[PDB]
Ligand SMILES: [Mg+2]
């Protein structure tokens with residue numbers, strides 16, 4: 325089930341503004357986060373916006389959500405998370 329599998333994902337930083345707005349939408353406050361915190365609020369955002377497939381809860385259908393605009397994706401799988409990590413490398417600054 326979604327948060328269970330989300331928690332299994334592999335990977336202090338100031339998110340760029342498009343990502344920051346997504347994190348604030350998920351209940352995050354301020355601008356300075358650990359990667360652990362960033363991943364946690366991304367999961368919370370995905371859960372409150374119900375972007376995951378009820379049937380296939382590793383699939384996130386993020387298209388025509390600002391998260392899909394940010395990722396440049398219609399979708400990603402938590403089983404093949406490379407596109408999320410591509411966006412995180414572009415959108416977290418030390
Ligand atoms: Mg702060």
Ligand SMILES: [Mg+2]
Nearest residue numbers: 327331364367
């Ligand atoms: Mg979590």
